[PDB]
Amino acid sequence: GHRP
Amino acid sequence: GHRP
Amino acid sequence: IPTNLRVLRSILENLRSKIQKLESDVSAQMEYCRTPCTVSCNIPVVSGKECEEIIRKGGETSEMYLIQPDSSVKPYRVYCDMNTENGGWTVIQNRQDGSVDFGRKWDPYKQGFGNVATNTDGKNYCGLPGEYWLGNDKISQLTRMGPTELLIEMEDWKGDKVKAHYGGFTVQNEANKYQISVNKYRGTAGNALMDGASQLMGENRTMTIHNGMFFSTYDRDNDGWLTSDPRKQCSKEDGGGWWYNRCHAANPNGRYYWGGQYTWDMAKHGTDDGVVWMNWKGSWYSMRKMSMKIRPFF
Amino acid sequence: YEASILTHDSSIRYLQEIYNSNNQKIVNLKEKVAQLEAQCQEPCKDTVQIHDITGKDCQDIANKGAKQSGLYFIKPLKANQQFLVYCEIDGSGNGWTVFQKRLDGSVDFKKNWIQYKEGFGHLSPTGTTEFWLGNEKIHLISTQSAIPYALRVELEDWNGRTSTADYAMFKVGPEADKYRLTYAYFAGGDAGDAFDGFDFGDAPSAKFFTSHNGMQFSTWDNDNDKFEGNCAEQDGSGWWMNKCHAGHLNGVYYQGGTYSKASTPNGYDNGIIWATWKTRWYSMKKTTMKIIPFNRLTI
Amino acid sequence: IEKVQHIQLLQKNVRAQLVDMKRLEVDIDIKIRSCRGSCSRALAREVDLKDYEDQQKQLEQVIA
Numbered sequence: 064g065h066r067p
Numbered sequence: 068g069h070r071p
Numbered sequence: 072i073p074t075n076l077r078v079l080r081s082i083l084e085n086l087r088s089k090i091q092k093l094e095s096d097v098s099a100q101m102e103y104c105r106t107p108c109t110v111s112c113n114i115p116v117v118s119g120k121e122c123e124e125i126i127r128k129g130g131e132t133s134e135m136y137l138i139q140p141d142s143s144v145k146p147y148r149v150y151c152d153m154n155t156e157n158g159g160w161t162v163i164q165n166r167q168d169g170s171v172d173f174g175r176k177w178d179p180y181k182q183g184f185g186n187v188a189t190n191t192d193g194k195n196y197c198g199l200p201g202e203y204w205l206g207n208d209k210i211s212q213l214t215r216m217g218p219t220e221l222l223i224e225m226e227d228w229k230g231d232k233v234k235a236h237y238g239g240f241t242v243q244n245e246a247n248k249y250q251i252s253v254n255k256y257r258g259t260a261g262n263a264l265m266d267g268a269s270q271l272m273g274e275n276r277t278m279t280i281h282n283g284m285f286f287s288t289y290d291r292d293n294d295g296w297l298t299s300d301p302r303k304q305c306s307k308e309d310g311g312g313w314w315y316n317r318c319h320a321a322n323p324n325g326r327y328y329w330g331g332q333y334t335w336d337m338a339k340h341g342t343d344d345g346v347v348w349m350n351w352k353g354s355w356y357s358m359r360k361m362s363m364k365i366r367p368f369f
Numbered sequence: 370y371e372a373s374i375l376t377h378d379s380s381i382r383y384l385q386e387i388y389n390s391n392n393q394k395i396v397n398l399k400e401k402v403a404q405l406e407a408q409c410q411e412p413c414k415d416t417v418q419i420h421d422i423t424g425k426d427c428q429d430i431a432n433k434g435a436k437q438s439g440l441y442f443i444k445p446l447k448a449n450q451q452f453l454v455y456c457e458i459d460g461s462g463n464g465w466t467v468f469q470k471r472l473d474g475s476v477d478f479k480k481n482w483i484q485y486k487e488g489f490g491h492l493s494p495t496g497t498t499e500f501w502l503g504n505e506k507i508h509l510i511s512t513q514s515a516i517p518y519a520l521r522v523e524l525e526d527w528n529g530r531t532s533t534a535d536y537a538m539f540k541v542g543p544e545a546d547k548y549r550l551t552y553a554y555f556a557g558g559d560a561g562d563a564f565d566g567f568d569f570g571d572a573p574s575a576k577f578f579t580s581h582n583g584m585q586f587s588t589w590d591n592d593n594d595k596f597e598g599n600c601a602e603q604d605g606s607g608w609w610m611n612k613c614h615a616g617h618l619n620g621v622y623y624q625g626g627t628y629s630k631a632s633t634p635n636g637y638d639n640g641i642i643w644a645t646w647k648t649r650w651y652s653m654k655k656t657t658m659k660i661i662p663f664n665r666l667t668i
Numbered sequence: 669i670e671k672v673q674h675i676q677l678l679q680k681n682v683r684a685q686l687v688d689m690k691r692l693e694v695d696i697d698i699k700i701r702s703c704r705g706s707c708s709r710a711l712a713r714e715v716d717l718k719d720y721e722d723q724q725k726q727l728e729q730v731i732a
């Protein structure tokens with residue numbers, strides 16, 4: 064997943 | 068063992 | 072004059088029966104041998120020249136691994152001990168249940184025999200070693216790759232353990248009758264390979280030293296015992312192939328006696344055949360466990 | 370009670386008879402023992418066997434005549450030594466070299482750099498085991514001179530549904546470049562292009578930061594990702610991490626498929642996911658990554 | 669004498685066949701177990717040397  |  | 076034919080008749084009738092039982096047992100085993108035992112050993116992905124390279128490559132569990140000492144010969148199966156003394160040990164000989172015959176001729180001992188490993192009960196890989204002799208050609212090629220050390224481990228039927236460590240170990244090829252050489256000993260089992268039976272003196276002790284000996288099998292006499300009688304060969308008497316001298320202080324590939332303790336009247340030829348290591352338990356005690364492993368020496 | 374002296378003659382012979390009888394029976398038993406011996410020499414029969422046919426890769430092998438899928442030895446041109454692999458051969462003469470496989474979570478994929486470089490897990494003739502072939506081998510297979518390869522990804526959920534994702538000109542760089550993953554383009558597949566990244570709605574650049582083309586490989590003990598943190602370490606795996614991922618085939622094997630934020634220690638999605646086919650919170654039941662020369666993929 | 673000689677021989681033969689057998693019993697035990705690593709199964713069994721040892725001290729007696 065994306066890790067903002 | 069040996070063989071004298 | 073008194074009671075005699077009484078006792079003599081009793082024993083003979085008893086033995087008659089014993090023969091009946093043995094014939095039964097042997098007859099039953101022959102039927103079981105119409106089909107073989109089996110195993111399913113999935114092959115680990117990691118491979119290397121030997122177990123030491125494999126452990127340095129991440130193979131950290133003791134099980135069957137495929138190794139390829141050199142691009143010369145094809146890869147082959149071996150059991151790697153990745154837990155004993157920092158792991159990286161390539162097992163070349165293993166005894167633990169008498170499940171494999173070791174009284175074999177020159178060629179089998181040359182090619183290797185037995186079972187490298189068996190299934191870990193419910194697993195797809197073989198994480199348990201079996202009994203086997205890696206193979207003289209193979210053991211030789213492995214030891215000549217570079218300095219090699221040898222670790223010999225044993226255990227009696229009570230659970231006691233002792234080890235014989237050799238910092239240097241080499242085995243020449245077939246042309247040199249797989250001549251053995253070891254040095255730099257240390258351990259708790261006593262240096263039987265170099266110094267001989269610790270329970271003998273002078274000439275008697277010296278003739279039991281293995282260091283420097285050629286390898287002998289019952290069909291190939293290269294022992295340090297000169298005789299004219301074809302039955303007076305260390306391998307024919309002490310069972311199996313080994314670097315016999317005249318004859319031994321250690322008999323790792325001897326006959327597997329259940330229970331440990333055995334005596335001259337049980338032995339096929341009266342000699343002390345059997346998984347023997349005199350420097351620790353004497354001549355008439357057969358180890359429950361016995362193994363030989365190697366690793367590159369640093 | 371001790372019989373007459375005239376009995377000693379008959380009694381003495383009776384023993385001499387059975388004694389000799391015993392002897393003959395022994396000589397015959399010893400013989401039978403000899404015959405038994407010749408039957409107990411062979412080792413147990415191992416069911417897993419390796420085929421003889423060898424070559425540069427599974428396709429080169431399938432070209433030489435091999436028909437059944439199983440364990441084979443291949444040795445790419447630059448390879449210093451041959452190694453074992455699992456080949457998949459269909460009825461069309463196609464030989465795929467499988468380099469990754471998940472199917473039961475029996476193998477821990479939280480390995481280090483060396484382990485991912487050399488490979489871990491087990492190879493089976495029935496293709497029923499989990500494993501990672503090894504970055505170096507993958508690198509060697511996909512970078513052979515003038516042979517462009519393709520990567521096929523196969524997924525399967527816990528409902529029997531399977532999907533695939535193809536990638537043309539699949540390549541894996543050398544250790545010097547941290548086994549960087551690259552490819553020419555998505556070649557199609559009902560599994561969706563997870564390598565192109567996925568808009569997670571987290572930011573205006575979720576797409577870019579979860580794309581894998583061009584990403585180097587990463588493990589907890591060797592961080593080469595585009596994140597100030599350590600993707601490989603947080604998700605506990607080895608992979609071509611960005612910041613962090615849209616497709617994570619080497620993640621924690623979640624039994625059942627469905628898992629959640631609470632399932633993890635940190636809270637991040639670390640399962641065997643592929644965002645274009647299932648939610649980041651749906652770990653696959655079966656996974657397989659295989660390669661083959663591109664010219665072999667449908668004309 | 670006549671029958672005293674036939675009996676001398678039987679004591680030497682029975683004493684030898686007891687040792688011979690005690691050995692075959694061991695040989696068989698070892699050989700059967702060495703099949704466990706080759707054949708489908710190895711016949712489960714156990715050796716009772718006692719019955720051989722007792723019959724030996726029992727014989728040595730009457731011989732005296």
Ligand SMILES: *[C@@H]1O[C@H](CO[C@@H]2O[C@@H](C)[C@@H](O)[C@@H](O)[C@@H]2O)[C@@H](O[C@@H]2O[C@H](CO)[C@@H](O)[C@H](O)[C@H]2NC(C)=O)[C@H](O)[C@H]1NC(C)=O
Pocket residue numbers: 071271272273274275276
């Ligand atoms: C070398 O060994 C031989 C063989 O004897 C056996 O091994 C001994 C170490 C000891 O354990 C003996 O009890 C074993 O029987 C010895 O042979 C001797 O031979 C002479 C004549 O041939 C005989 O009179 C002796 O009785 C034998 N030994 C004895 C005292 O039993 C030999 O003496 C041993 N020499 C050494 C180096 O100790």
Ligand SMILES: [Ca+2]
Pocket residue numbers: 292293294295296297298304
């Ligand atoms: Ca000789």
Ligand SMILES: [Ca+2]
Pocket residue numbers: 592593594595596597598599600
């Ligand atoms: Ca980072």
